[PDB]
Design a protein around this ligand. Structure first.
Ligand SMILES: C[S@@+](CC[C@H](N)C(=O)[O-])C[C@H]1O[C@@H](n2cnc3c(N)ncnc32)[C@H](O)[C@@H]1O
Length: 207
């Protein structure tokens, strides 16, 4: 009964109003947002490793929310909050501009079929919305195990003034410590790891 037990402590309800991060987290500290955290393994690991920072997760799949809460409770985390609501609405309504150190989007629904391509969350307007919530120097880190989606993500992100690709080859980045290795990955495999990480830093507009 993880939801029932831990939602009152770590859950954050949808609101028409902006979040006050100091009020929510009881301190002034960097805030990282993970969108679509699934069962929250990455988010819990990240919060556990960074007690000095604060973490917000959003996930519409409520069993994933419950799994994340159960794990967060088991790990004794005080620096994690979760939401169960459309992330785009949360960004629009509740996340203040220029407030986030990092936004993570790991394995967003890849929508393999061409007819479903518009359902993919990484599109220009979404990426711009995320950018507006990053502090300058903040980073949007996404990952996918589907190359067509990786290429699409790269095209979207490369087209937006104010995002600087942190890839030294102008495409993809090495997996950072802040994303755990997954089962979709053969690290060091001759044909590639099987997961594409993209990281872009928010920089001042060039135009
Ligand atoms: C393929 S799963 C990956 C989950 C997790 N990051 C992982 O790697 O295991 C994609 C997740 O994104 C969530 N998701 C899709 N759209 C969302 C949205 N608009 N707001 C919040 N979560 C969303 C889904 O519910 C799903 O759990």
């Amino acid at each position: 009964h993880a939801l029932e037990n831990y939602w009152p402590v770590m859950g954050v309800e949808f609101s028409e109003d902006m979040l006050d991060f100091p009020a929510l987290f009881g301190r002034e500290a960097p805030v990282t947002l993970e969108i679509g955290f699934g069962m929250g393994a990455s988010l819990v690991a990240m919060a556990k490793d960074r007690p000095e920072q604060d973490f917000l997760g959003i996930e519409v799949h409520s069993p994933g929310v419950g799994a994340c809460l159960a794990s967060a409770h088991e790990e004794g985390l005080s620096n994690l909050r979760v939401m169960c609501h459309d992330a785009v609405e949360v960004l629009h309504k509740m996340i203040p501009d220029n407030s986030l150190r990092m936004v993570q989007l790991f394995f967003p629904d890849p929508w393999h079929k061409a007819r479903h391509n518009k359902r993919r969350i990484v599109q220009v307007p979404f990426a711009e919305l995320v950018k507006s919530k990053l502090q300058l120097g903040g980073v949007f880190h996404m990952a996918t195990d589907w190359e067509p989606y990786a290429e699409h993500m790269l095209e979207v992100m490369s087209s937006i003034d104010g995002y600087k690709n942190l890839s030294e080859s102008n495409d993809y980045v090495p997996r950072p410590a802040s994303r755990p290795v997954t089962k979709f990955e053969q690290r060091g495999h001759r044909l590639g790891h099987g997961v594409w990480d993209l990281m872009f830093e928010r920089v001042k507009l060039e135009h």
